Structure formats: structure tokens, C-alpha cells
């Protein structure tokens, strides 16, 4: 009479059916990978890599497929924006079909390993009872894991046999799948240095092999064997749950903060690029350099790439989103069509005014136009009676350099107020919202959703470590206690 929450304990003491259920979970995961890839390819728009990349459309597995080398498709389109001459069998559709067929094969193998559960391999040769030599199993599977880690690091990513991984410029303007040379110096521990990824996966992998050869040759000591409850599968479950939630915390942190393994051309910008003005400073530095060359403001701003300006927009901030604001970023805000340009606000005196940008914390932010010396010179007041820094009172005009509105100046207060309100969000873009019926509230980029999901899983699996490990240590008393 097992309660509904204990049913899957039936395979605790059955190695064969444990293999079967683990095969079934593996088959389900592979099937989900294939199906998700197929759905994403079906609903993906590859026409415009600029202003409409993958992270704008809510793609979740496309970033990873592109990160590890798969770029082309059988539909004739490349994620980089070129033409697919010969995508080969390793296109997105190829990966989806492969993971799907693997899921089916694992389903069949699960059926078999379930029917023929009573294999003599799982019998203890001496006693004849069913038993698993957990130290030796860990040694074998760790040796395999280390071998695979070294192989992936040395051949893949380095491009010796594999294709490499996604490497981009610091500002995410020109990124592509490239081979990576390992970084053997201290800079190999720079999180944003790509060269660490091969070298690590090499060196660590090597250690794994050696570690395997130890945990496969040397039997654990009796004191350690009974202390760590080696020989109980639930102890292994507790330790594995702990390790996996540790890894989940690490990956969530490394994606929220960004690293060489989570490029912004695949997951979108981080919130710390908006907070610290990572792109705004670069744009203004390029503009200033062009001006120092003698160019006018219009030419200097026309020289700015549209993708770089698009990164400098608060709508792409992963932290400007909602828990139930579902779907693609294009579903909340319209599909980007073009860059309006750069708005320069100037009072009737000629003093240049800058619009205070919305911080990541604020859902709504009042519009303030600030002097170069940090002195508020204009605003859109909430109380139009006896206002002091009104747009009409100060006489603010907005001139657009570059983009769609190039060399266009607006002086009517309504248009100036509208454009200042738009510019408080960063660079101003035109959005087509009729196509997807965008409501008008920002969604979160795929890196935000990934971080949220895997952080919640990390917490729940910390509770899993606690529970399954308590059950491990207190196995004798978890069938009941004999009073004191």
C-alpha cells in the first residue's frame, strides 16, 4: 500500500528496472529536445539577424544549438544572415531529428531493460543476492565522463576536429562559431575569456580520467564506507542531487552575469550592461572619435551600426520583464523595424540637454532633461500648474541625427515630450506591433528565463539534497523508532 508519493520507490532495490526508468527519463528528455527544436524552427523568423535576432523571438534551444556550432538549416537560411549553400545533416532540423530518433531508441531499450529485469549481472557472485558495487560503478562512469570531457575540450571548441564555439566581439556586433585556442595562463580563469573553456575542459578532463583510475582501483576504507553510507543507492542520490544543484547555481549565476559561454548575440544583453552603460559609453566614444576626425554630428551618428544602438535599449534588458508576461520579446513590444536615430535635445539658449535614462528598477520613470553639469534644466511635469521646468517654458527642441529621422528637427512641445519620453528608454526605434498584436509591456530575454528556471530548480534540489540525504543517514529509524 504505497502512498502516491512513494510509488517510484518500487525500483529502489531492483537494478534492472532502475536502468529502465532512468532510460525512460533520458528518452523523454531527448524527445523534448527534438520537439522543442522542431517547434522553434517552425515559429522562427530568420530574415533579419539585426533588430530581430533569436533572443527577441523567445528561442530557447536555438541559442544553445548555435553556441555549440550548429548554424545552418535545411530551409536555406543561416543564423548569421548568409545563404545556406550546404547545411549538411547537422542543421537545426538534423539535430532535432537526431535527438528524436535517439529518444525512440531509448524508449525501446527502456522497454527491454524493464521486461528482463532479473539479470545475473546484478547478482552478488558470493552471496547470490542483488547488489551494486557503487564505488566501482562510480569509478567506471567517472572515467567515462572524464574521457568525454577531455575529448570535447581538445577536439571540439578547439576546432582540431570539431567546429569550435561561438566567439564574439566585446560589443556583440560580429560573432560567429570559431575555433578557440586554450588559455594556459592566469587569463584562462577570466570568465569572459573564451580560451578558458577549452583549456579547462582539457585539464579537468584529464584529471577526471586519473580520478576515475583511482575511484576504480582503490576500495574505500571501512570507516569511510560506513560513514558515507556507501552501498546504499540513496546516499548516491543525495550526493548527486547536491552536486547537480551546485551546478545549477553556477550556471544560473554565469548566465545572469554573462560570460564567454553565454554570448549576448544568442541570449541577449545582461542587465549589468544597461546599468553600467556598457553600450552607451561605446556609442558616445565612437561618436566623439568621429567628431574629432572633423565629421559632422549627422555623419558621426550615421556611422553607428544599428545593432549596437539596438543593444542600448531598455526593452532588451532581461530584468525589464514580468513573471506572467509570457512569450517572445516581440509579443510585448513590437517587432523592431528600424532605428529612428539619435535624439539631441537643446533648449532655446542652446545648452545641450540629456534625458535621464530609466534605471532597471523602475517600471515607470519621470522624464527629466539634465544639463551637462548635472543640473536639471527641463522635464515633463506632473503638475502643469505653476510649472518651473516645463518643455514649453524652457523651449526644448529635438534634432535627430542618423537613422530614419536624419537631420529632422521638431520644435512643437507635444512631439518633443513624446520623443523625450521615448528616449528615457535608451535608443529610439520604430516597432511594428500590428503583426503580433503586441500589448506594450516588456518581456524578458531568454537568459532571464533560463536564470529564473534554473535558480528555482537549484533551490528545490537543495531541499532534495536535504530530504534524500536525511533519509540516507537515518534509514534504520525511518521505518520507525523504538522509543529512546
Amino acid at each position: 500500500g504505497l502512498p502516491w508519493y512513494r510509488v517510484h520507490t518500487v525500483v529502489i532495490n531492483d537494478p534492472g528496472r532502475l536502468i529502465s526508468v532512468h532510460l525512460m527519463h533520458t528518452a523523454l528528455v531527448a524527445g523534448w529536445a527534438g520537439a522543442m527544436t522542431l517547434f522553434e524552427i517552425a515559429v522562427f523568423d530568420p530574415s533579419d539577424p539585426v533588430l530581430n535576432p533569436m533572443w527577441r523571438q523567445g528561442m530557447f534551444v536555438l541559442p544553445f544549438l548555435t553556441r555549440l556550432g550548429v548554424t545552418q538549416s535545411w530551409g536555406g537560411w543561416t543564423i548569421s544572415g548568409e545563404t545556406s549553400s550546404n547545411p549538411g545533416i547537422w542543421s537545426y532540423e538534423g539535430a532535432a531529428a537526431s535527438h528524436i530518433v535517439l529518444s525512440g531508441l531509448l524508449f525501446l531499450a527502456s522497454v527491454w531493460h524493464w521486461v528482463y529485469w532479473d539479470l545475473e549481472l546484478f547478482r552478488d557472485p558470493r552471496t547470490g543476492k542483488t547488489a551494486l558495487d557503487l564505488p566501482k560503478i562510480f569509478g567506471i562512469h567517472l572515467f567515462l565522463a572524464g574521457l568525454l570531457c577531455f575529448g570535447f575540450g581538445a577536439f571540439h571548441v578547439t576546432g582540431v576536429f570539431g567546429p569550435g564555439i561561438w566567439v564574439s566581439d566585446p560589443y556583440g556586433l560580429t560573432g560567429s562559431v570559431q575555433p578557440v585556442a586554450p588559455s594556459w595562463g592566469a587569463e584562462g580563469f577570466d570568465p569572459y575569456n573564451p580560451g578558458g573553456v577549452p583549456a579547462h575542459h582539457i585539464a579537468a578532463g584529464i584529471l577526471g580520467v586519473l580520478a576515475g583510475l583511482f575511484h576504480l582501483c582503490v576500495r574505500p576504507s571501512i570507516r569511510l564506507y560506513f560513514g558515507l553510507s556507501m552501498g546504499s543507492i540513496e546516499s548516491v542520490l543525495s550526493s548527486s542531487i547536491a552536486a547537480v544543484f551546485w551546478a545549477a547555481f553556477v550556471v544560473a549565476g554565469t548566465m545572469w552575469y554573462g560570460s564567454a559561454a553565454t554570448p549576448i548575440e544568442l541570449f541577449g544583453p545582461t542587465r549589468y550592461q544597461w546599468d553600467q552603460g556598457f553600450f552607451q559609453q561605446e556609442i558616445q566614444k565612437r561618436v566623439a572619435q568621429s567628431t574629432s576626425e572633423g565629421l559632422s554630428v549627422s555623419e558621426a551618428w550615421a556611422k553607428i551600426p544599428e545593432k549596437l544602438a539596438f543593444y542600448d535599449y531598455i526593452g532588451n534588458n532581461p530584468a525589464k520583464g514580468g513573471l506572467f508576461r509570457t512569450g517572445a520579446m516581440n509579443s510585448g513590444d513590437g517587432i523592431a523595424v528600424g532605428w529612428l536615430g539619435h535624439a539631441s535635445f537643446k533648449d532655446q539658449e542652446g545648452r545641450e540637454l540629456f534625458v535621464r535614462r530609466m534605471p532597471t528598477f523602475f517600471e515607470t520613470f519621470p522624464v527629466v532633461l539634465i544639463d551637462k553639469d548635472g543640473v536639471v534644466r527641463a522635464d515633463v511635469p506632473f503638475r502643469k500648474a505653476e510649472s518651473k521646468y516645463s518643455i514649453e517654458q524652457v523651449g526644448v527642441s529635438v534634432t535627430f541625427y542618423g537613422g530614419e529621422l536624419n537631420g529632422l528637427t521638431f520644435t512643437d512641445p507635444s512631439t518633443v515630450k513624446k520623443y523625450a519620453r521615448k528616449a528615457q528608454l535608451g535608443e529610439i526605434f520604430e516597432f511594428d506591433r500590428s503583426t503580433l498584436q503586441s500589448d506594450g509591456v516588456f518581456r524578458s530575454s531568454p537568459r532571464g528565463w533560463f536564470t529564473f528556471g534554473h535558480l528555482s530548480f537549484a533551490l528545490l534540489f537543495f531541499f532534495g539534497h536535504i530530504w534524500h540525504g536525511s533519509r540516507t543517514i537515518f534509514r534504520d529509524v525511518f521505518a520507525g523508532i523504538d522509543e529512546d
Partner: peptide, 28 residues
Amino acid sequence: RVRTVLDMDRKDPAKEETVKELRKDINN
């Protein structure tokens, strides 16, 4: 030739939290 002082004085009004302002702030 870029005027770093003007660059900082442009970033500060739009965003005071910019890394341009905070870097070498005690020097200012």
C-alpha cells in the same frame, strides 16, 4: 582624439551609475 572629460560629462547626466563615472572617481 577623444575628450575623456566631455565623455564622462555626457554619460553622467543620462546615467550617473555608468562605469565611466565610477572608474577612478577619487582622482576627480
